[PDB]
Symmetry: D4
Subunit: 253 residues, 8 copies
Amino acid sequence: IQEILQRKMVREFLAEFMSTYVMMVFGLGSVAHMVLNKKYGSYLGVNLGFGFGVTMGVHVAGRISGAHMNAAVTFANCALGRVPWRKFPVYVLGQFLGSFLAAATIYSLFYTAILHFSGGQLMVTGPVATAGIFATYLPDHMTLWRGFLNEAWLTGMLQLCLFAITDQENNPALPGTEALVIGILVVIIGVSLGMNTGYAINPSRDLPPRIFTFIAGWGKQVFSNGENWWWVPVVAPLLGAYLGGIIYLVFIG
Amino acid sequence: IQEILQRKMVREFLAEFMSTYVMMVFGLGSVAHMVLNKKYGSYLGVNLGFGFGVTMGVHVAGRISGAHMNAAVTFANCALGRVPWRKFPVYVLGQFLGSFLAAATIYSLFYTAILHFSGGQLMVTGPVATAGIFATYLPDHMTLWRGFLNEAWLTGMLQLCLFAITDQENNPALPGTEALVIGILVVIIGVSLGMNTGYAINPSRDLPPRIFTFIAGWGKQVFSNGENWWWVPVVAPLLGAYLGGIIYLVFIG
Amino acid sequence: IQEILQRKMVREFLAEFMSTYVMMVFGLGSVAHMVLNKKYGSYLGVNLGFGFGVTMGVHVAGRISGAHMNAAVTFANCALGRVPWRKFPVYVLGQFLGSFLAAATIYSLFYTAILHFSGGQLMVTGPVATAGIFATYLPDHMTLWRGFLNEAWLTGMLQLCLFAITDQENNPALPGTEALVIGILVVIIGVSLGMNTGYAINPSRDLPPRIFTFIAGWGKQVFSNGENWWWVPVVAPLLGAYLGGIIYLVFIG
Amino acid sequence: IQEILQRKMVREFLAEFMSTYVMMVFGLGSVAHMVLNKKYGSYLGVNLGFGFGVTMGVHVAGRISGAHMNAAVTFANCALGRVPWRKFPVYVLGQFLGSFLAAATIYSLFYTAILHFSGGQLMVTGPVATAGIFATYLPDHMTLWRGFLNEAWLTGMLQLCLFAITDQENNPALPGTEALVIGILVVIIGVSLGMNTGYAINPSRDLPPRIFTFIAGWGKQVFSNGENWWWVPVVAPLLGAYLGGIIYLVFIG
Amino acid sequence: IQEILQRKMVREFLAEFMSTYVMMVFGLGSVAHMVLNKKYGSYLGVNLGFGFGVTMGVHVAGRISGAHMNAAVTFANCALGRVPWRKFPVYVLGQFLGSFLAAATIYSLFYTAILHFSGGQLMVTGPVATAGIFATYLPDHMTLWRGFLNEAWLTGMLQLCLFAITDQENNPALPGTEALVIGILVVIIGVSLGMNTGYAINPSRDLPPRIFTFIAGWGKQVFSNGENWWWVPVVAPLLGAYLGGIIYLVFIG
Amino acid sequence: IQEILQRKMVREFLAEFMSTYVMMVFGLGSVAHMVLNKKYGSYLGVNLGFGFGVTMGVHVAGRISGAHMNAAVTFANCALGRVPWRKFPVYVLGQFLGSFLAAATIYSLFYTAILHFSGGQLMVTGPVATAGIFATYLPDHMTLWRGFLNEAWLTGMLQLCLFAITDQENNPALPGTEALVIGILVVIIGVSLGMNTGYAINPSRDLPPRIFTFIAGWGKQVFSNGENWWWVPVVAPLLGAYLGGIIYLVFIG
Amino acid sequence: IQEILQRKMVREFLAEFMSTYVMMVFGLGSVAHMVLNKKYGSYLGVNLGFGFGVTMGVHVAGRISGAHMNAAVTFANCALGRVPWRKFPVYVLGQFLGSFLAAATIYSLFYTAILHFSGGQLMVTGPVATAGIFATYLPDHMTLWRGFLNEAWLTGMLQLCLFAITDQENNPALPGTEALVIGILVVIIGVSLGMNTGYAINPSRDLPPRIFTFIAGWGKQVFSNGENWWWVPVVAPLLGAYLGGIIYLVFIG
Amino acid sequence: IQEILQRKMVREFLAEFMSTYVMMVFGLGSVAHMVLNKKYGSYLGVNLGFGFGVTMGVHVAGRISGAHMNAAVTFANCALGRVPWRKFPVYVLGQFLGSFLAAATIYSLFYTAILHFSGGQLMVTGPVATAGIFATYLPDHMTLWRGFLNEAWLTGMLQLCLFAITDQENNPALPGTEALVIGILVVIIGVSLGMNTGYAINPSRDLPPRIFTFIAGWGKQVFSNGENWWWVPVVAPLLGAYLGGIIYLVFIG
């Protein structure tokens, strides 16, 4: 047991797992606060929760593995030559397990409030829908390809700013202070551009919680709602992150 | 008098007393603002008050004693070998005295507003209850063991992130800037996970103010409300903090 | 292609373009959130979006060109001898192109919400006016020369504080941390003094989006509304920035 | 003219004048936003405006004179031996002139909004009172000596935390970053303890604006309102600041 | 067919059926307006709908059968000697059939609004409960025997006032105008005493609609909700009406 | 027992008792609806309840005794020669007993709602005061003699209009329809002039319910509240009614 | 000119014209009050306006022509043998002209309010739609045949109650008082059943105002909105009125 | 004294005085309730107060003088030959004196509420204007001749319906019940058409209260507000009433 944990790959798997768990617990707690309680919840609270959960995760795993906490970010780093391809499955697996367990924790901590709010009914759509605490669903006036464009553009902006903040050659944040700046970046992505799709901008933030809600009793409407919307938050961020990274590397690097 | 204050144990006692007093005054002021006045109070204000009161306390006593300001944090540090056991009573005594005097100060500063709000009646429960300014009480839909689970998990998260932020080996905040990051951690614990129990996560934040309200005229219902809820915020945080610390030490340290 | 991008002037043009684009996308997204949706929008969100978009732009282009992102700031720097006059057209052209493309992006991302809010009508004035998402318009009780005074004074305050923050001789922010302080300065300019004119302290923030709305289908009322208000946000900031800079240089530098 | 500005006392006078002007303009702008407009104003905005105006003033005059911006802080520093007594009149005069001119500027920038809100009537008391934009007035349920206690205690807390933040021996903020921490301290003093008296905690923030409102057309009720309340915000902060400083020096220094 | 309708008992059955149908359609329409739509519904609208539906029913069947429209009123009239006992089953049967068909009509006319409001879920309890459009359910703070007392007292008041209004010996309403006065009596019974139980005060108004909701898809919780509340609105009104009638006859007649 | 109830004086006593009971039950039910529940209560409901309770009482006792239901009306009729003086005690006694029992009935029917609203505390003053359901209390900005003037003038208007409505020689309401017109008169007295004192305009409506609240557990503050306000609603209506009656008799009769 | 106005048919044409004009002016004024102004408008006001406008029209033309004011009522009376068929065109023509001129009058009286509300845009659909002041449009969740059923059933109820109120052989309203009862019937039809379609229940209330809005500048969308909804309010009321009349005649007559 | 009051002309003068006083007291009380208090006031209350004050005045003076209570109604009756011209000054003088004294009474009864609402300032325009309790003022978006048209048309409708209600040849209200119908007519004139000008429709309702406010301390702005609006409510009703009367006489009489 002691010997196994000493291996480098096991350490990196554990670092990704822990950082993703912390970030997702803070973010989903903010979303549940907003949905269930009108006095104690706000949209700004959701933005703050997700951003500074990212800050805490970066403090947890910044040096061991880079603290990607995001499958699109890992894909963009691997495809641009900065991370070897053999580390992609390990990081993605750790992020997925962390996100799934964070969804389970939020379900356990807020159980009575969910039941009191919904009247005992676990509904995907309607005035007392609660499946949106865990995953993202398409709003009323928006179509599928508009949401695809939104997800791609937001992930591209995120990747470009992430490259700018941590670039030791150009103009980085002072070492030891970059976690705060990354958290603020995520906060303002939520503040400025987060109402058209719910700004998933992360496959790990979106798919494992949807699987958990499917298992836990919300039914199969989690996948078929919004004319099969579930696959856009998995595919659009990869393309967006790659394009944003290549744009920064060509024009500013 | 000059000679006595020069001793090391007296200095550490005074440091814990002062830091706890400052933190508790800011936090309870935020809570009173929220309860008494609807124009000037908000939940985000409560989160900000507690978190950045923690920041100011860390600046006051960070070097002399470590600025625990929390009996669960002291217990976890002593039980994991980082602090000697003989310093536990001194730190806990200083924290308790500071919290009690902060409650007395908040009572003195907000007296007329409390009387005007409540109509002269000091009530634990009801539409004009004011005992929740000082201590925490179980909400309507929540049971006792759900609250126990909530307190334990929140204190565990706090301890794990505290270990991550101040770890010189892994990835700490830049020295001279860690108080801000600790304050932000407390702020987002309030934002994301603080409505199910009131997020005491601190025996020193909870018990001395309850004793003060019992003495000052709210009666014995402060102890028996919520089927004897008073002992959960004293016991659950110790277990939570120990488990979070051991988890961080094993898997990330 | 590789050779052309290596030239210094091309690099500075691209840096100004990218930083202005990032800042304007974040700011206009905040404004659209406020106007279209009442649940997800607030004035504080607008202030945060603009300020920390400025922070991200400074991280993008701080070292290559100085990250002015503001035509008045460039004019004041060139007129006070700190930047050569031959670089003025390049910087201004890059800022204008970035702002125009950011307006186009915000139009594309929020299209369905704009149509749903306005009922299909692109109106400059009225209860469902949407031209104020992109540019600034004079409020009900304010006259033209009052707005001129407001714009000049706000830009003067901005320039004086910008000189104070980045002055290595007097008392600067620690290198690697000044982007946060500049963002906070912009945030509080919005918070304290931004309701009389909309604080379009930047000509690049104001004119290219107005041109875009004229082209895209809001008509010629964008220019003639408010007794030809469009030229004040272009002229007043230059005078304000110059006066604030000269005041700081004489009395504090 | 050039020779006169080169003297040290003239430089310190100008530094205090400029820093106080900047801080007061930001703070009074926040207060006017809150009072006049319900959509664009909030209490949190007032707290943010005052705190980060303090941050900007510290950046302006931190090294030249220490950036007291507060007559009580200057009195406490001079009485504890840290500043010579001959510099007290110069600093206080500069602060008073800066505060008076900031009040005049806020009057000029918000003139039409004030007239539209009040119906043309400059009233100290009533549903359309506007004298509270500039100075502080006692609330409905509070007496004079309760307000005296509030002012003294708040100024004492401010001075103790100011000593803690800037103490190079104990545990200071990292040099180049202390302005942010001081601003956050002022923000949370506003958030937690600022509704009982309006948290003037500064004679320079209170008396010159009251004199300006007396001159500008609000009448002599600015002085006699609240059974001659005007002198408490001048006298209580001095005692509070001295006591807080001596407490910190004895027990923590 | 022509001969059968000419008989007296058939005519009285038809009169009771038609009058009950009209009254119940108006009343249940008012209740549905209140529950489903917040803009177009109010409690005063419910009171007006029930009272003046009673007025219209009295105009329909006042001379043929007396227009009881109420099983408790029929029981009290038969038990006090004013109506022969052999007419009790015919009147009660007609009233029950009319009430059942009125519930079916209200279900058909408001179908889409019910589905849109409830999200497709037919719920007896919760934030989107719709079974209360048709029948009455016990409120949160009230017990079973308190509701029994309420029903008995309200029906007694109704019967006493009905005897007073239509008494040709004492002081009746002018013939040809008594329907308006009876409607106003029902309106003010709703206005003054109708929130503790929903003021059924009519077995025919309560039981057939509950049977319809049981059949139509709300389930068996319509009968077991509120610890078997369904039988109180059937039994309490009979006793109340008898006591009120005997009191009026003894003390005023 | 069959002959004691046959006497004329016993009949008139019973008529006054029953009519007062009915009127007071409807009125106090309306007031309780307004105070306890915000959804189901309104001021217009209070006006309607009192006015049409007067209508129902007039139908109950219009011919037997005149249906005064008001001690001031009885005093004015006796003092102007229309009723013999020996009938004054009998009528007043019946009205007082009816009002007392109506207060007891309203207490019994609304018990759980009162306890749930007030938190178990029976308070005369404060945000959860419930003594105003039964009696009238002086508002915030009104003095004692202003209320005296209000009561006298309102009772004078009531008496003048009552004389006009029931005058067979001038222009009466058609016999058999005057109860509706009297009810409408009371409704509009409530609508137009009822917020300065609560428009008791009746000693029987005011004193017996106050005695009941004193007995039932609200304490002796019911009498001393508002600097001994209890005696004005007993004395002012007599003078007002006499003056209004004499004015009508002289100038219109 | 005197000779022509003395004929019978001209007299009945003028009676129908005047009564319809009065009724429509009151009703459309109520609707405009509700739509344009939130302080001065309510749904209950709309119900009252239409019902008591019907009362005033009945007083105007009750004896000369019967005061149908409704093409469906005229059709039902003619088809059941109570009115000769040769009078149908004259009555319908008078009603149509009266309704058209009432729409023109309401347009002239409320012109500035309409322009101020809509921003100068005459829109059929959207947040500032104003075509619903004059005609009826299908709500969001309702289909065409549901609205057909609603219109037919409401007109049937109206005709049955109209037959009951004015039947001299069964139980009529006292002659000279039936206009009030008819107005109350229309009021409660609005209160109970008027939100699903807008309760036109009258071709004359619906078609001429729609023609006026088409002419006056709302465009051709008045006819094609709601999937050619315009013809349902013309056809459904005839069938409903006939069925209700025949039902009353067979079963109660 | 006894002999003088016996003369016919003195009797008619006193009847007009008393009826106008009663009507105006009820109406102005309703308006004051609406303006001063938001909980206890509504627009429907204003309509009810004015209409049923008209009902009570008709009961007071219906037989002695006809109960015009309106100078336009008197002018129309005199000009159409129904009343001799020599009675015009007596009726108008009585109405004017009654209206003036009713304004004085409303001023005396609501004095403290007016002072508390306005802060001691008697203002014609602004957020705390109180001159509109007594007279009518032109709204924001309306011009002078639009208001002239509104006043003329409303008075014409009133006169036509008044002729219809009291016409013994055509179809009158049953004698003894016409006061209720006249009150309802005034109520629905307020409900449907009363927001564009305040529906004075009466010179006696408008001018004497304006004179009282000029005398009592509101100043000369009562006459010059709204570009000399005061004379329209005196002149437009006469023309409107004459035209409506002549239209009814020609086409329906």
